[PDB]
Amino acid sequence: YSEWITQPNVSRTIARELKSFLLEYTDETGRSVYGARIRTLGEMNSESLEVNYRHLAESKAILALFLAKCPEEMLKIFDLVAMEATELHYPDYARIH
Amino acid sequence: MYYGISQFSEAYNKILRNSSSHSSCQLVIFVSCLNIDALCATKMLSLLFKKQLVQSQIVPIFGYSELRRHYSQLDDNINSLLLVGFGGVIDLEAFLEIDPQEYVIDTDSGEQSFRRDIYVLDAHRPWNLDNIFGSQIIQCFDDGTVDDTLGEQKEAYYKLLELDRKQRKKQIHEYEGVLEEYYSQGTTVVNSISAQIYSLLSAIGETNLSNLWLNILGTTSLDIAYAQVYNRLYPLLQDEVKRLTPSSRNSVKTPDTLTLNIQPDYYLFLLRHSSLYDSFYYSNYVNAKLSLWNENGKKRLHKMFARMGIPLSTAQETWLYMDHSIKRELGIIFDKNLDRYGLQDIIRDGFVRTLGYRGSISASEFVEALTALLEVGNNSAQKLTNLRKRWVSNFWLSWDALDDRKVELLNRGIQLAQDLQRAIFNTGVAILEKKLIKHLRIYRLCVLQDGPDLDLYRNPLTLLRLGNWLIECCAESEDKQLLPMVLASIDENTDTYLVAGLTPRYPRGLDTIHTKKPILNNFSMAFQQITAETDAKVRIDNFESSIIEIRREDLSPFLEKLTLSGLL
Numbered sequence: 321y322s323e324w325i326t327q328p329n330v331s332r333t334i335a336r337e338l339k340s341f342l343l344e345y346t347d348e349t350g351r352s353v354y355g356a357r358i359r360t361l362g363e364m365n366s367e368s369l370e371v372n373y374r375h376l377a378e379s380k381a382i383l384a385l386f387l388a389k390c391p392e393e394m395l396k397i398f399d400l401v402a403m404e405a406t407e408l409h410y411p412d413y414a415r416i417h
Numbered sequence: 418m419y420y421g422i423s424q425f426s427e428a429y430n431k432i433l434r435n436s437s438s439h440s441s442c443q444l445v446i447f448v449s450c451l452n453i454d455a456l457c458a459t460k461m462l463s464l465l466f467k468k469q470l471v472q473s474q475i476v477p478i479f480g481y482s483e484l485r486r487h488y489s490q491l492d493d494n495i496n497s498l499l500l501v502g503f504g505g506v507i508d509l510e511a512f513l514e515i516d517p518q519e520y521v522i523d524t525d526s527g528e529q530s531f532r533r534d535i536y537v538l539d540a541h542r543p544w545n546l547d548n549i550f551g552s553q554i555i556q557c558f559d560d561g562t563v564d565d566t567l568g569e570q571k572e573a574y575y576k577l578l579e580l581d582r583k584q585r586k587k588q589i590h591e592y593e594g595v596l597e598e599y600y601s602q603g604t605t606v607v608n609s610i611s612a613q614i615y616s617l618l619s620a621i622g623e624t625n626l627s628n629l630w631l632n633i634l635g636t637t638s639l640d641i642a643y644a645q646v647y648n649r650l651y652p653l654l655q656d657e658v659k660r661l662t663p664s665s666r667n668s669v670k671t672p673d674t675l676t677l678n679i680q681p682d683y684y685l686f687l688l689r690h691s692s693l694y695d696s697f698y699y700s701n702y703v704n705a706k707l708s709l710w711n712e713n714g715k716k717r718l719h720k721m722f723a724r725m726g727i728p729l730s731t732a733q734e735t736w737l738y739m740d741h742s743i744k745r746e747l748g749i750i751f752d753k754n755l756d757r758y759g760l761q762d763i764i765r766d767g768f769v770r771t772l773g774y775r776g777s778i779s780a781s782e783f784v785e786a787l788t789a790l791l792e793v794g795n796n797s798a799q800k801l802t803n804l805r806k807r808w809v810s811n812f813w814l815s816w817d818a819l820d821d822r823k824v825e826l827l828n829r830g831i832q833l834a835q836d837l838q839r840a841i842f843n844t845g846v847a848i849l850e851k852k853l854i855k856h857l858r859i860y861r862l863c864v865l866q867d868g869p870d871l872d873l874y875r876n877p878l879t880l881l882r883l884g885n886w887l888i889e890c891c892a893e894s895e896d897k898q899l900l901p902m903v904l905a906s907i908d909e910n911t912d913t914y915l916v917a918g919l920t921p922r923y924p925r926g927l928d929t930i931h932t933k934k935p936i937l938n939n940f941s942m943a944f945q946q947i948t949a950e951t952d953a954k955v956r957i958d959n960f961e962s963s964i965i966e967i968r969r970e971d972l973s974p975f976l977e978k979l980t981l982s983g984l985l
Contacts, residue, residue: 362723363716412726 321390331397337380338401343408345375355409358402362410367417369402418564419549419557425617428536428556433469435534436497442472445491446499447484449539449960450477450812451878453787455502457635458538458610460819462499465623477812478503479805480958481512488513496533503960504537506604508547509555517554529553538613540606541962546574546596560608570599601984603920603937604962606643611635612650615657626675629657630780631819633677633768634787637780641701641885644925645935655679658768672773681748682767682779686838689777690831693739694722694732699838701886702925705893706759710846717758725754737776762926772821786830790815792878793833797911801966804875837879840870845886854887854902859980860918863887864905864972874906875915877964884919892924899923901940901985903976907969914972918944918963918985938963939985947978 324330342354353375361369377384387394406413420428436443444466448459459475466473478484484503491498500509509515520531531554538558548555549563550571557563563571573595580589615632618624633654640647658677668674685696685703697703697718708714722732727750731743743750748764755761769779794811818826847868848854854863865871874880884904891897899921905914918940923932941962948955948965953975956966967975979985 359720363720365723365729410723410726413723415726416723416728 321386322393325386325390325393325397331393334383334386334394335397335401337383338398339404341376341380341383342401342405345379347375354405358406358409362406362413362416365416369406371398371402418559418561418567420559421564422559422561422616425558425613426620428558429617429621431534432497432536433471436495437469437471439470439472441494442474443495444471444473444497444499445495446473446475446501447478447487448475448812449502450479450809451791451876452502452960453638453784453791453815454540454610454635456787456791456812456815457631457638457819458614459501460816461611461614461618461628461631462501464628465618465621468623477809479808480960481507482958483805485513493532498533498535500535500537500539502539502610503541504535504555505539505548505557506541506543506545506962508545509535509537510547510552515554517552520554538610540608540610540613541604542607543600543602543604546570546599550574551578558613560613562607567599569595573599601942603939604941605935605937606639606646609636609639609646609650611638612653624657624661626661626677629654629661629677630770632657633780634784634819637768638784638788640781642922643935644922645933654768670774674771674773676771678769678771679766680769682765682769682781683747683751684763684765684781687782687785687831687835689736689779690782691835692733692735693727694718694729695835696736697721699835699842700763701889702762703760704842704886705889705924708890710842710849710890721754721758724757725750775824782831783827785834786827787815787818788878788882789834789837790818790826790830792837792876792882793873794830797913800910801913808876837873837882840873841879841883841886844868844870844874844883845890848887849890857900857980860901860903860985861891862903862976864907864914866907871906872908874904875908877915877917877959877961880904880906880915880917880964881919881961884917888919888922889925892922899936901938903940905967905972912969914967914969916944916965916967916972916975920963943979943982943984946984947975947982951978 325334342358343352345352345354347353354369354371357369360366373384373387376387383394387398403414432444446459446462449455463473463475476487478487484500510517517531520533521529522532523530533554534556535554536556536558537548540560542562544557544559544563544567549557549559549567551574573592576592577589577596611632612635615624615628618628636647636650636654639650658679662677684700686700688696698709704710704714707717709718719729722729727743731740734740736744751764755763767779767781769777771777791811791814794814795807814826815830817823818830844865848863848865853865854861865874874883884902887904888902891902901921902919904917904919907914918938920936920938922936923929944955944957944963944965947953948957951974953971954968955971955975959965
């Protein structure tokens with residue numbers, strides 16, 4: 321798996337899927353959970369994005385399995401994805417964190 | 418007209434001939450305290466008369482009662498009187514009990530001369546026609562309004578004066594109607610006294626950088642409540658700055674260079690003397706455009722700062738120590754990320770003066786410091802006089818702040834300005850949360866009955882500051898229609914209120930046809946009419962006409978009669 325994740329094509333696919341999950345995941349009430357979480361993150365210069373594992377398991381369960389099995393690289397990929405999403409909501413956020 | 422723009426030099430030469438004697442001090446300048454424009458105008462006059470060694474006396478007068486008492490005390494030797502910031506809207510000869518036959522010497526020969534000359538110098542437009550037209554002792558420094566917009570009133574006044582059948586009576590009523598419609602008009606401000614005296618100085622040729630700076634301060638004192646006047650007068654100041662600045666530009670900074678500059682001066686609150694976050698947070702305009710008084714406003718502000726990419730730690734840093742990377746990119750950052758929140762009007766051009774190595778300061782900040790020094794610088798009919806005494810004393814603190822050698826006083830003024838804006842913000846969020854402003858179909862009343870630091874609001878300037886805060890907040894609310902507002906503040910020691918009838922104004926930066934027509938404050942005539950009948954121990958003495966002191970018990974019936982009064 322670590323070798324599977326480190327493949328550039330697999331890494332790009334995983335990053336795209338995680339970005340889609342962050343941007344498009346919606347819960348029962350219908351509002352985007354992680355859009356609001358990223359708004360709050362940037363607003364308080366939080367530097368940390370709290371991502372529920374149940375959400376990651378419900379949608380794209382293969383990514384949740386990868387994260388629970390080889391978190392060393394999945395966390396790096398998902399950190400880059402979170403930075404991209406925050407820069408989408410808060411452009412030029414790299415100056416803050 | 419009495420004295421036009423082109424003949425100010427005539428008035429100055431008349432003053433010089435009448436009272437430029439080194440033997441004694443025959444010139445007395447009456448200045449209205451609690452007016453930055455009058456303060457700067459009197460500073461200009463003081464410097465000008467210091468150049469010509471004309472002995473003069475400067476008296477700060479707070480109310481009309483003090484003016485009358487001082488004039489009664491005034492000796493007959495003093496043959497030149499200057500009234501700065503007031504006197505142009507009342508019958509001064511009647512108010513002061515002046516009869517020209519007792520002040521006339523050498524009547525002959527079509528000419529007349531008088532033993533004392535009173536020069537009124539103010540900007541409130543309801544010129545009293547018995548002053549601008551029917552009196553020779555009282556000499557008004559007009560700004561060109563009377564010679565162009567008072568022809569009909571001039572004819573109506575002169576016909577009635579000269580005339581002391583059916584057609585004659587009908588025409589008299591027609592003319593008297595013209596005079597009456599001229600009255601029953603709200604008191605506005607069209608010009609700045611500092612600009613008028615600077616025009617006089619330009620006529621005499623005594624203009625210099627210090628006088629130009631005083632002119633800029635006096636004009637910028639009008640930007641909060643009369644932004645149309647400031648926008649009208651701004652090009653003249655812009656031209657004067659270019660004219661007076663020496664050609665030796667881009668030179669190295671030396672401990673002696675004084676530089677008037679026209680550079681981006683954002684419409685924030687004490688930006689250079691406080692943190693960026695505090696400049697946005699306590700700004701009147703930003704508060705109006707974001708409604709920071711409620712809880713969600715602070716979240717909006719933090720979100721804006723994150724959007725610009727300015728960390729909160731950097732944002733809350735003092736402006737001097739803010740990292741040069743961020744401080745040099747304020748223009749670009751504000752261009753990118755201000756139209757999103759509707760704060761595009763924040764970006765603005767102002768005047769910034771640096772004195773050698775002492776750091777920059779803008780006229781907007783300087784007038785806030787001066788106002789703070791005026792406000793908090795230092796049984797019932799006696800403690801109030803003590804308040805008047807302290808209020809007069811604060812005028813000299815604000816006067817000494819102008820001197821370049823007293824920067825340690827200007828810094829104290831800046832600190833007081835920050836404290837007063839904090840107190841104003843706290844009281845504003847207290848008023849808007851409890852919904853103290855009672856909406857009406859005539860005027861949105863608001864009475865301060867209890868709370869913290871309520872002793873700050875017995876000063877008319879602080880009460881006007883709070884009123885301007887509230888009016889700016891209400892002006893940016895589309896749902897709330899324009900309507901005059903009333904503020905009151907109980908003085909526990911004297912058991913008296915301080916009613917301050919205000920005026921609404923259009924949103925800043927919104928230029929339309931109805932915006933061009935100024936809003937007129939009708940509270941003066943209403944207050945005077947209500948007080949004339951139904952004796953209620955009302956004290957109408959302020960030069961600011963729409964401010965009265967009313968007893969605690971008599972406030973409610975007064976407001977009831979005012980509601981019944983359709984004048985305003």
